[PDB]
């Protein structure tokens, strides 16, 4: 149920393939419809989740470098997939920028994203 | 400078290869020397970092399933590599467990790891 296209609630989208043994691969687009905002996504998921109605744990990383931009930063999303009628991937994220050692305490932003199969 | 073996300060280790265009691939071992605690690691790094002494941003994920255990959870590490004599990878991590919807607010632990090229005392 993970493979396919997902949309956060702010205008981003990603397209992921879930491999049989736990691989996540795909592309993250920070702005729907803007190909210059597409970045490689790689991660992992639990490929044998519990059957008791629990979500499926997963995570992935985007380093914010492509052929048009290098923000010298990377974001990780940690969360769980919940299937069904209103399938969602609920996540929290960490965005770390490369910094000098003096600025290392300002290196990491935190936030959250909810991904759905339909646009907000 | 990233490719190789790293140790956190609590007894874990990982071995990563940094590909030329930003891939991180490797194995994470929660307990040094215990092969049944080895898990696949996949992530990304900035393969053209700033040259001004800034660290190199990176992140990776481990899903805690292998042939011996399935914790139904996954951890992501977000941080930066700093090279030199005492090279380190400074990170913060998120550990999310699959939960029921009623327990979803108890799903995600947060913490930090500092990885070095040599083992802690
Ligand atoms: Cl796979
Ligand atoms: Cl690569």
Curated annotation (Swiss-Prot), chain A:
Domain named Avidin-like: residues: 1-120
Residues annotated for biotin binding in this entry: 28, 39, 77, 93, 105
Cellular component terms (Gene Ontology): extracellular region
Top-rank taxon: Bacteria
Gene Ontology molecular-function annotations: biotin binding
Chief location bin: secreted
Placement of sequence motif Cell attachment site: 44-46
Keywords recorded for this protein, A-Z: Biotin, Secreted, Signal
KW Glycosyltransferase (keyword) present: no
Localization per record: Secreted
Subunit annotation: Homotetramer.
Described function: The biological function of streptavidin is not known. Forms a strong non-covalent specific complex with biotin (one molecule of biotin per subunit of streptavidin).
Stated family: Belongs to the avidin/streptavidin family.
Identification of the protein by name: Streptavidin
Organism this protein belongs to: Streptomyces avidinii
Range covered out of full length: 40 to 159 of 183
């Amino acid at each position: 149920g993970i493979t396919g296209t997902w949309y956060n609630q702010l205008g981003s989208t990603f397209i992921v393939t879930a491999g049989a043994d736990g691989a996540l691969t795909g592309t993250y687009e920070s702005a729907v419809g803007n190909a210059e905002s597409r970045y490689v996504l790689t991660g992992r998921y639990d490929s044998a989740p519990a059957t008791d109605g629990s979500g499926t744990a997963l995570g992935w990383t985007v380093a914010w470098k492509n052929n048009y931009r290098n923000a010298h930063s990377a974001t990780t999303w940690s969360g769980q997939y919940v299937g069904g009628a209103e399938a969602r991937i609920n996540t929290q994220w960490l965005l770390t920028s490369g910094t000098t050692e003096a600025n290392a305490x300002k290196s990491t932003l935190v936030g959250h994203d909810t991904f759905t199969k339909v646009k907000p």
